[PDB]
Short mmCIF file of C-alpha atoms and ligand atoms in Angstrom, two decimals:
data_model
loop_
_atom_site.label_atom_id
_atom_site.label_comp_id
_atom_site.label_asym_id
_atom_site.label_seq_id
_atom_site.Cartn_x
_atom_site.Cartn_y
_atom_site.Cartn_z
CA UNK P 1 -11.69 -17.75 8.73
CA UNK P 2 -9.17 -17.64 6.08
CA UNK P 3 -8.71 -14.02 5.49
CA UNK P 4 -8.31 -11.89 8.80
CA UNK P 5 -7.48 -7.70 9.30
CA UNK P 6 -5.94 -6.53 12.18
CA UNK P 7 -4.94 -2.66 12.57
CA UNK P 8 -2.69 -0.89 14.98
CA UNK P 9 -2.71 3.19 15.76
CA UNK P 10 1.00 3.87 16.21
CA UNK P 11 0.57 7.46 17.58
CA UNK P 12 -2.68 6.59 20.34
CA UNK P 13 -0.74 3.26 21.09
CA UNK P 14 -4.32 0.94 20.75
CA UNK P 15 -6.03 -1.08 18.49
CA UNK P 16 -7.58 1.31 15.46
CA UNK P 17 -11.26 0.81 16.02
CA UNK P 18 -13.79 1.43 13.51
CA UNK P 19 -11.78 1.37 10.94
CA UNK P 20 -13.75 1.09 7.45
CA UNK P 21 -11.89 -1.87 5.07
CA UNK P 22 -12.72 -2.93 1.84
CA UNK P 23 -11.77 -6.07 0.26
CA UNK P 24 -11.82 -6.33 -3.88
CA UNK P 25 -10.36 -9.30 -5.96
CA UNK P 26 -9.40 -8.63 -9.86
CA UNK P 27 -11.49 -9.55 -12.60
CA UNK P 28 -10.70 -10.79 -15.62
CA UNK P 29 -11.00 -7.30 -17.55
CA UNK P 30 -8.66 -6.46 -14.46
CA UNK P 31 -10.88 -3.88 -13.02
CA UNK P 32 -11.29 -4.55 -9.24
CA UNK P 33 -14.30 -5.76 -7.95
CA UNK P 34 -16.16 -5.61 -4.61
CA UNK P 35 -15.44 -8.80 -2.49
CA UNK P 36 -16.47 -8.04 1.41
CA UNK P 37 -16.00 -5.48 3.49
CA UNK P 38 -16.04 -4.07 7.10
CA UNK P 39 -15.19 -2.52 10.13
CA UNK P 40 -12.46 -2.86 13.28
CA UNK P 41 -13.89 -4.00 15.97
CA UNK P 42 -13.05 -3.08 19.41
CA UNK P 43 -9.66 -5.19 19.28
CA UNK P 44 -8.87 -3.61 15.94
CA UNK P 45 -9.23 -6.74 14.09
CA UNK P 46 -11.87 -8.11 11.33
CA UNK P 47 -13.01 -11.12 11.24
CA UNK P 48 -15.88 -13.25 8.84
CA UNK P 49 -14.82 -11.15 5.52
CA UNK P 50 -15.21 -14.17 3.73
CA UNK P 51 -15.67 -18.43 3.36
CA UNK P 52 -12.94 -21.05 2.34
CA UNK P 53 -14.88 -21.50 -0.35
CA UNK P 54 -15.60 -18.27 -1.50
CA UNK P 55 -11.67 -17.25 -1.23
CA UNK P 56 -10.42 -18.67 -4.41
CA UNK P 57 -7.37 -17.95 -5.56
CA UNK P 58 -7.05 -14.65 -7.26
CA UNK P 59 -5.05 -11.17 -7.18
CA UNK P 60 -6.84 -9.29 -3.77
CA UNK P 61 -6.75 -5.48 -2.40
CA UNK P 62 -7.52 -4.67 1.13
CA UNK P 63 -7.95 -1.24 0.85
CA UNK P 64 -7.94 0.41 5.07
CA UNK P 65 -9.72 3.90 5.00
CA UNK P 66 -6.56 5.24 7.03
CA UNK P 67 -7.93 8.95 5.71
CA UNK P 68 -11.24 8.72 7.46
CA UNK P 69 -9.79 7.13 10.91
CA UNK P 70 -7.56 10.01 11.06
CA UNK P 71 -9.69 12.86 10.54
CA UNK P 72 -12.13 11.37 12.90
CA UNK P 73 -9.12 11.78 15.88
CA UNK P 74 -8.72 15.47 14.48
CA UNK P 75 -5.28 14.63 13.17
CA UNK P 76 -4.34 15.68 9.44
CA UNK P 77 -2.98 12.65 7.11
CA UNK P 78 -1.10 12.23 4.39
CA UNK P 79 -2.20 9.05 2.24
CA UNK P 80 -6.15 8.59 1.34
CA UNK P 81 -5.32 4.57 1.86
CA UNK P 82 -3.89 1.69 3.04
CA UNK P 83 -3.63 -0.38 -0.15
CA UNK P 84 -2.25 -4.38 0.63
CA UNK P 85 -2.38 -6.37 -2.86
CA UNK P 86 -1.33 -10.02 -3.10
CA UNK P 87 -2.32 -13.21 -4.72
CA UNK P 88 -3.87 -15.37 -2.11
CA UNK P 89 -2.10 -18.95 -3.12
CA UNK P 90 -3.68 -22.76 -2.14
CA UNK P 91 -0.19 -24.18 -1.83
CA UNK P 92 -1.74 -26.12 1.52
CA UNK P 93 -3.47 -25.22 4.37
CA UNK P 94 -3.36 -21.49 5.43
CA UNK P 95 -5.22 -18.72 6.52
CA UNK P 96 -3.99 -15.36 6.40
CA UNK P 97 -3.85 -12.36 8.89
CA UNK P 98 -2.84 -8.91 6.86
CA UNK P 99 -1.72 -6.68 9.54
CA UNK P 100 -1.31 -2.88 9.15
CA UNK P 101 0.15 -0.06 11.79
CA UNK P 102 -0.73 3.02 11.07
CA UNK P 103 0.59 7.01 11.86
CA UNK P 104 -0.20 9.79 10.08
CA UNK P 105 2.49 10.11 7.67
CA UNK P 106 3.14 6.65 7.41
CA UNK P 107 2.16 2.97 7.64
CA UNK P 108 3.29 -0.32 7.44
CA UNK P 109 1.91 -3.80 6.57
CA UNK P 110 2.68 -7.17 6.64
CA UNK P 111 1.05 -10.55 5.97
CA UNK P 112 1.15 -13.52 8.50
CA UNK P 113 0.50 -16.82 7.12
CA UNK P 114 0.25 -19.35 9.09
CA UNK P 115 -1.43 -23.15 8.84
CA UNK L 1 12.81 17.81 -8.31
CA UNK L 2 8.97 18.03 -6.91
CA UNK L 3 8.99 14.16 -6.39
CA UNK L 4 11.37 11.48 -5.09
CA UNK L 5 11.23 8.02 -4.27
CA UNK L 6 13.48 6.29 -2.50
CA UNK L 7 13.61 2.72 -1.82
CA UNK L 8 15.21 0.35 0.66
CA UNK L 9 15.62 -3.28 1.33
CA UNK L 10 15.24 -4.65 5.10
CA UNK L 11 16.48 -7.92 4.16
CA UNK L 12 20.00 -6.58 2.92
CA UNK L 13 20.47 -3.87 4.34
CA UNK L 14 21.08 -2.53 0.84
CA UNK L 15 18.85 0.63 -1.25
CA UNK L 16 16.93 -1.29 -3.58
CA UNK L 17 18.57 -0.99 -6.99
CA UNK L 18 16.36 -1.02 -10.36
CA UNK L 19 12.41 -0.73 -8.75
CA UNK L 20 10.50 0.19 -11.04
CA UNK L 21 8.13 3.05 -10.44
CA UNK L 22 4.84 3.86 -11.79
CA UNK L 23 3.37 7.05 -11.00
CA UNK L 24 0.00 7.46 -11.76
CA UNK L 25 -2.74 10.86 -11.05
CA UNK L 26 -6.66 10.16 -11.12
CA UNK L 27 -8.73 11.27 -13.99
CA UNK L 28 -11.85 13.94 -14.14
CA UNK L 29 -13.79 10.32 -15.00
CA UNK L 30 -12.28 8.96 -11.53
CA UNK L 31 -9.99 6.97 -13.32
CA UNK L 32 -6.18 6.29 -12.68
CA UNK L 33 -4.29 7.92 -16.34
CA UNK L 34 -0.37 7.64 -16.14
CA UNK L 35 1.55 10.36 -14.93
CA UNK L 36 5.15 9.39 -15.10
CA UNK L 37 7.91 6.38 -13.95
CA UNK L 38 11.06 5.23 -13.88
CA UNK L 39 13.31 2.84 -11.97
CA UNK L 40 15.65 3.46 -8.79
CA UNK L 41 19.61 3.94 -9.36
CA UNK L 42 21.87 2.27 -7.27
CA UNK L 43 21.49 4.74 -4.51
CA UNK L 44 18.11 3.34 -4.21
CA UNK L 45 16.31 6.62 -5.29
CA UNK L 46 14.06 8.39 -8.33
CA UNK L 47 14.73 11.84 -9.36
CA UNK L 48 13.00 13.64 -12.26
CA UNK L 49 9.97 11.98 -12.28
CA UNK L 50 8.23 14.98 -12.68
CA UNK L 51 8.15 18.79 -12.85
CA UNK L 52 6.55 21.81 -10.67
CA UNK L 53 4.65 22.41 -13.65
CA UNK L 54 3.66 19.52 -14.31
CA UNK L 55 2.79 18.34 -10.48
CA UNK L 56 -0.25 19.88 -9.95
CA UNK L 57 -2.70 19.53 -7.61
CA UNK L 58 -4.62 16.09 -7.79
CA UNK L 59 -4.52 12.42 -6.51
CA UNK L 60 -1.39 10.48 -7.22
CA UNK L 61 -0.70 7.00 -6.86
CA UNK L 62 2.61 6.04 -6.62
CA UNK L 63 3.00 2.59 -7.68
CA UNK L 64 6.28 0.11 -6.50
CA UNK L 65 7.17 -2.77 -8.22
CA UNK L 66 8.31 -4.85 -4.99
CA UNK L 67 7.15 -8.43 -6.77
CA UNK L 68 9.83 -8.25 -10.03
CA UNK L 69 12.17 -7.00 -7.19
CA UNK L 70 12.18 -9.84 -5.17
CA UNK L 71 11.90 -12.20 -7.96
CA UNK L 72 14.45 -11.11 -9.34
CA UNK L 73 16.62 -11.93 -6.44
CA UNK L 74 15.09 -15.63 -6.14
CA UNK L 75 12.40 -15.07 -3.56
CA UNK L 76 9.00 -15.32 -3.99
CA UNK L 77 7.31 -12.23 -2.16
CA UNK L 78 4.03 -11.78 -0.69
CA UNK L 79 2.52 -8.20 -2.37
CA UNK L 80 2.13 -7.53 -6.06
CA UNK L 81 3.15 -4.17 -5.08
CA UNK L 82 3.68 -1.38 -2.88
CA UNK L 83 1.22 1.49 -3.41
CA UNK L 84 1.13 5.04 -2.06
CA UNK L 85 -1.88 7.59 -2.60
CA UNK L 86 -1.94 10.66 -1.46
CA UNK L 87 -3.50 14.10 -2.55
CA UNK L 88 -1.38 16.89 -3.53
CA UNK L 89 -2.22 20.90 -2.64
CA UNK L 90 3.29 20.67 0.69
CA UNK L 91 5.84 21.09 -2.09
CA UNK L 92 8.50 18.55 -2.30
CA UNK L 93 7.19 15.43 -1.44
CA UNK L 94 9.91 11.97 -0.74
CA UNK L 95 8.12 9.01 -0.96
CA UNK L 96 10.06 6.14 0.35
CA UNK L 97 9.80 2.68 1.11
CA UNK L 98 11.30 -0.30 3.29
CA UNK L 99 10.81 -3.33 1.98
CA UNK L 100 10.50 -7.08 3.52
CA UNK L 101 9.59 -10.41 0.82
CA UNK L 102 5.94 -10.31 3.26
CA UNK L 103 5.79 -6.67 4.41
CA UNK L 104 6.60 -3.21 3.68
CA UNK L 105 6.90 0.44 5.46
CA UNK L 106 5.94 3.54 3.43
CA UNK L 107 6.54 7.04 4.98
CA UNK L 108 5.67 10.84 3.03
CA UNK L 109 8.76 13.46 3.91
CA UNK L 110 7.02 16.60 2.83
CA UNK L 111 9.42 19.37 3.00
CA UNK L 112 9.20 23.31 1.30
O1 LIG V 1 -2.73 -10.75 14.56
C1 LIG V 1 -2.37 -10.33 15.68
O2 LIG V 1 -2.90 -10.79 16.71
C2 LIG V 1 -1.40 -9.32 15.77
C3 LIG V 1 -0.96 -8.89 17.01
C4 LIG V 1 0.01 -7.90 17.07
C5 LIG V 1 0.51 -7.37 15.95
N1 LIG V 1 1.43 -6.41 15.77
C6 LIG V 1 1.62 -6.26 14.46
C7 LIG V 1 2.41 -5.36 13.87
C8 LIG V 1 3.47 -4.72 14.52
C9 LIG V 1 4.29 -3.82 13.82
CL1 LIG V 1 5.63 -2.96 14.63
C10 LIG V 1 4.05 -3.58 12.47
C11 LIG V 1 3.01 -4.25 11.83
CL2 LIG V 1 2.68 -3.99 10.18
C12 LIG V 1 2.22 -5.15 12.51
O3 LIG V 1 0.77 -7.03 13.82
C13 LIG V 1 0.09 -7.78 14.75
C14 LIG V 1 -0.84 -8.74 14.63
O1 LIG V 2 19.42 8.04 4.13
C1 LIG V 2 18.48 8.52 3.48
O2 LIG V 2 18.69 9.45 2.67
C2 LIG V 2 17.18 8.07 3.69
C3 LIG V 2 16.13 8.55 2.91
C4 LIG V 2 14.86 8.06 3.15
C5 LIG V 2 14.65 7.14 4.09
N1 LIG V 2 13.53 6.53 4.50
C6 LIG V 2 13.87 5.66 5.44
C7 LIG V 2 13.01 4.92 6.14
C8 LIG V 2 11.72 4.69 5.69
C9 LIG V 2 10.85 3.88 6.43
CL1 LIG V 2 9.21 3.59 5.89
C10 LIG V 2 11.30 3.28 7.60
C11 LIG V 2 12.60 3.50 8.04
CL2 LIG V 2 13.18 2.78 9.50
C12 LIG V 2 13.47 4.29 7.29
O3 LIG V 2 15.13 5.76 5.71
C13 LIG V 2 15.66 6.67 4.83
C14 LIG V 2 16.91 7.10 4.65
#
């Protein structure tokens, strides 16, 4: 599993289940194109987006439908996204585990990557 | 001054001096057409960006340029980018930012 989503509700305290993420990678007319997607599970967390070797390097969006989670709790949100771009590098082993909390107003990310 | 980013850096404890800013505001064809940018002063923040005439309803992106930031003080970050979208109807909106080389906070201060 070398690409892994976890996501945090910062105002219910809990995992943010159900949450819908899409993953895209850049193309070379640099339009972004569909790469896997999901939901949360349970735990909050997404796992099997993608294969080793599938997950070549390349400029990647997770894009975390914070808008739809929040109006599904009945509280109003600011952003329509969670947007998390990077470019996924093979210097060695790693996986990597993009993390996002999230509140209404507000969210943060970051990316642990680990071998 | 409808719009204002403000940016900060978690690893100095500094505002983050000279981000550049993209703003952009999506298209009747659903694409993203540039609205406006500029770069933060040495207070860390973005004024006149735009105008209340100008700011009209829509969806914005706010684009932050967190990868020449970092770079450009030796460390290789993680995101190409902090981005921000949002849709506008609520008048003065602050956009800012806390940024870490692998992670980044982004909060909305909408105020009258
Ligand atoms: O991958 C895991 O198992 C795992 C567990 C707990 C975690 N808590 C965070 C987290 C906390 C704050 Cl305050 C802000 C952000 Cl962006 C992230 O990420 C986690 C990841
Ligand atoms: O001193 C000011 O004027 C001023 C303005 C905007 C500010 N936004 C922050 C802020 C943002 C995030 Cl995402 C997380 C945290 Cl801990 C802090 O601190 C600010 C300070």
């Amino acid at each position: 599993c070398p690409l892994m989503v976890k996501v945090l509700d910062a105002v219910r305290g809990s995992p943010a289940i159900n949450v819908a993420v899409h993953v895209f990678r850049k193309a070379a007319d640099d339009t972004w194109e569909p790469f896997a997607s999901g939901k949360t599970s349970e735990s909050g967390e997404l796992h099997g987006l993608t294969t080793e070797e599938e997950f070549v390097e390349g400029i990647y969006k997770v894009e975390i439908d914070t808008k739809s989670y929040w109006k599904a709790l009945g509280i109003s949100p600011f952003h329509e996204h969670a947007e998390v771009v990077f470019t996924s590098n093979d210097s060695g082993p790693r996986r990597y585990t993009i993390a996002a909390l999230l509140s209404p107003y507000s969210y943060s990310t970051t990316a642990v990557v680990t071998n």
